[PDB]
Design a protein around this nucleic acid. Structure first.
Lengths: 63, 146, 103, 194
RNA sequence: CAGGCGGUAGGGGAGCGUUCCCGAUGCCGAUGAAGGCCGACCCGCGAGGGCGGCUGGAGGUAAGGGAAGUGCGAAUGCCG
RNA sequence: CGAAGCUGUUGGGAAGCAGCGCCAGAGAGGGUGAAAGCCCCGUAGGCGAAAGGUGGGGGGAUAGGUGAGGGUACCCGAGUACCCCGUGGUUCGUGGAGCCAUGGGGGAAUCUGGGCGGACCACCGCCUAAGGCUAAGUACUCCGGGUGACCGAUAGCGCACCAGUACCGUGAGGGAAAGGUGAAAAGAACCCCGGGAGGGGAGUGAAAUAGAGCCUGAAACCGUGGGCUUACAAGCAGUCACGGCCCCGCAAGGGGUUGUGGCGUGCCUAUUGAAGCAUGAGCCGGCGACUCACGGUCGUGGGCGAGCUUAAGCCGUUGAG
RNA sequence: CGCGGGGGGAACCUGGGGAACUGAAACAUCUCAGUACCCAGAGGAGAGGAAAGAGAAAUCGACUCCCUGAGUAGCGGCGA
């Protein structure tokens, strides 16, 4: 029984009040692009449009 | 009283289940062309994904996952007035928190939004908001230091 | 269960559990509770023997076990058997009585 | 309630204004009742169950019928499923209801004929008969049933066989059986519980 | 009164049939519980429910709802 | 030790009933010739346990354990710790990994010394390793018990019947079937069939569709014997139809069967795709499969309702609390 | 001479030895598991046990069992 929620997932994400499955994304990990040129910059967070639902659950004991 | 056919109070339904039968819709399951029913049938905890479930991500929030301990710091407790401007007699925690509701808070912080009776209440740290609501129009105390 | 029912002949006493009238005791065992005392008329037809009065067909009997009887104590009804403090026999006794010290 | 010395007793203030929550009342109460009753039986099979001959027959061919696991949950002596489980499940509630319930109930059961000297005599308080002697000298007789709370071994080691009636003493609460009954009496409002 | 009505899986509405609970120091019950063979009446759309006859040989559980190892043609299944 | 009415009329038989009399701190349960508090066994209860012996608390308790401070002034569990490698445990898989035992060599010191607050230095804190003994509150079961919305003898316990046997094995091993006359055997007397066997009568017998693979006794499989059908005849067969052909209703009809005529590709599992010689289908009965624990999480009658909810115990609970 | 003691005992002890399947929808770390299971003394108990403790608090004060903390800290191809 018990169900000891999973740390990792919780190591990043969060439900902003509204119950919205929101958190960080993946990208500008210190360029990993190179090109002195320009771009990297662009970054931020984002919900999930169909999985999000699922996730939140395995964290109903830990919060 | 009596046993005047005390059925129930409207809505409930033990809606049990059952084995097999030939009545109504009895006998079936719903799926097919989707194998997954096993002795230890999946479970089923989320499972599936068939696409890492969009777990191509990665963690950045680095401040935990260390090992023995976590971060140790005496309690952090603020507040709001529109909670008990009711009684005061002497607004001091323990009398509150320790009562009505609210849990431990080593160091005291205060705010919220609404109004109240500017009366001296434990303040191991407060907000300018209260200052004015408890200065030339109120009463505020001091912190620990022991 | 256990071995606890009645006693010996003397008079015992037949009753009407579907038989009627009253008579003296005879013999009695407790295991299944079975015994005897004439009256109860029952005849067990013997087998192809002869040694005895002759071949097959039996004779008279008796038959019962559980409760269904009483004891002697003429005129009025009957009671039990009290104890002894400073009377006749030491501090023991009992031989079926009316309600005083007899039968 | 007496008619000897003391004479007079009235109540209902408790909450006459409402009194209309029968639904939930009876309901849940019914629930815990089921609990108490001991329900101890077992379930058997799981993997092994009986330390079977451990694996046996062939395959492909076999007695035509398929098989490998000597658990043979097919006969009247083999494994099956978990029907019972000594786990008669331990569910329950509080006193925040161990109250309200009988409240509204008896009120209407006062429209029946409650009363309750809160403490009455009868005689030897140890001789059954005489107790009832105050049953008649009061106005009761085996028919419409009732109960009562007598916190004293006295009438307890007395009331002995209380058919159609109560014969309590300690405190546990038995509303239900009162359902099949009616009238009653108390041992101080305090005994009920402040 | 317009309407709807075939319709695999699926997903609703109930209802029904099926063994312990109190009711059971209540109630039928040997002018019969229970099994049954029979029923070509009544009630159930059904679920069934009856409902009464003859064989039948010792108990049953009311309204109610409270609990569910069943609602099993079969798997060359277990067994007899 | 204990608690307290019967009675006749009918009834196999009466735990059937009226008219009513009854002990009841005791109307638990098993029960004695048909649905019994006052009837065999008990149940409030309170008597008392031994001689035998015998498990120990309380009591007493015996030998065997129990002052304070001040300066002199040396002295204490070693191949031991602490290093070291390979370590295991620790949540700790090398990782910034201490401390525990460390297997391997190193390898001291004993209080103005000595270990830990998870690296190497510096402040501060509780303890003192390398002797061993130590109850209580902890687990547990063949049975004793009880009870047990515990099963109730194709159950359950393998198993209530002389099984861990028949039996199969070589060992190990492995494993069966198989409860039920009746209130009382009262268990069959006797005489004609007669090979003993296995028959008929009679009797007992409330009951022989009561007698010993006998309880009640269905179902696959059995024809006696009955009734409706049949030798020009083609069929998943059954149906629907007028008709005729034997029981029952005054009538109305109700029937049973079937002639021919019409009508008829079944059934259980798979899939663009079925009836199908694609599988299964011995046959009838009978056994058979998602609770439930715990744990997560949307609804529902609810109550409280910024407020809204206490485990593990302790008195107590027949019970309950 | 003395005892001890081999030998005995349904669970429950202590210790010493100590897997694989399975999970990881492959697999080699990890998992099951220190589980299954072998061998080891004793008791009804057993094992354990009195601080070179905990930890941060002008602190607590033997050891065992339950209460939660906490499924938190954390361990982790930080994957399961």
């Amino acid at each position: 029984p018990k169900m000891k929620t999973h740390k990792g997932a919780k190591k990043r994400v969060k439900i902003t009040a509204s119950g919205k499955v929101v958190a960080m994304k993946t990208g500008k990990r210190h360029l990993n692009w190179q090109k002195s040129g320009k771009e990297i910059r662009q970054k931020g967070r984002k919900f999930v449009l169909a999985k999000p639902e699922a996730e939140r659950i395995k964290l109903l004991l830990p919060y | 009283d009596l046993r005047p056919n005390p059925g129930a109070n409207k809505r409930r339904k033990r809606v049990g289940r059952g084995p097999g039968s030939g009545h109504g819709k009895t006998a079936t399951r719903g799926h097919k062309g989707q194998k997954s029913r096993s002795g230890g049938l999946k479970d089923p905890r989320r499972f599936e994904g068939g696409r890492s479930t969009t777990l191509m991500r990665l963690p950045k929030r680095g401040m935990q996952g260390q090992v023995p301990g976590e971060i140790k710091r005496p309690r952090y407790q603020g507040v709001n007035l529109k909670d008990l401007a009711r009684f005061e007699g002497e607004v001091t925690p323990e009398l509150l928190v320790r009562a009505g509701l609210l849990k431990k808070g080593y160091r005291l912080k205060i705010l919220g939004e609404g109004e109240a009776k500017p009366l001296k209440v434990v303040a191991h740290a407060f907000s300018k908001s209260a200052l004015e609501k408890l200065k030339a129009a109120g009463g505020e105390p001091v912190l620990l230091e022991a | 269960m256990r071995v606890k029912m009645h006693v010996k002949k003397g008079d015992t006493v037949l009753v009407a559990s579907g038989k009627y009238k009253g008579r003296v005791g005879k013999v009695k065992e407790v295991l299944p509770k079975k015994y005897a005392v004439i009256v109860e008329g029952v005849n067990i037809v013997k087998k192809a023997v002869r040694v005895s009065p002759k071949y097959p067909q039996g004779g008279f009997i008796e038959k019962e076990a559980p409760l269904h009887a009483s004891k002697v104590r003429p005129i009025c009804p009957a009671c039990g058997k009290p104890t002894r403090v400073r009377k006749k026999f030491l501090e023991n006794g009992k031989k079926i009585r009316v309600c005083a010290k007899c039968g | 309630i007496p008619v000897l010395s003391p004479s007079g007793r009235r109540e209902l203030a408790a909450d006459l204004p409402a009194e209309i929550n029968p639904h939930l009342l009876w309901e849940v109460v019914r629930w815990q009742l089921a609990k108490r009753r001991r329900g101890t039986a077992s379930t058997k099979t799981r993997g092994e169950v009986a330390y079977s001959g451990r694996k046996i027959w062939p395959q492909k061919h076999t007695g035509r019928a398929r098989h490998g696991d000597i658990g043979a949950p097919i006969f009247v002596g083999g494994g099956v499923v978990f029907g019972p489980k000594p786990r008669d499940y331990s569910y329950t509630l509080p006193k925040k209801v161990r109250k309200k319930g009988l409240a509204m109930a008896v009120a209407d059961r006062a429209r029946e004929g409650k009363l309750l000297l809160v403490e009455a005599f009868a005689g030897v308080n140890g001789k059954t008969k005489e107790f009832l002697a105050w049953a008649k000298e009061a106005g009761l007789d085996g028919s419409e049933s009732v109960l009562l709370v007598t916190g004293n071994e006295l009438v307890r080691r007395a009331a002995r066989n209380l058919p159609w009636v109560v014969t309590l003493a300690p405190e546990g609460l038995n509303v239900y059986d009162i359902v099949r009954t009616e009238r009653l009496v108390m041992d101080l409002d305090a005994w009920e519980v402040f």
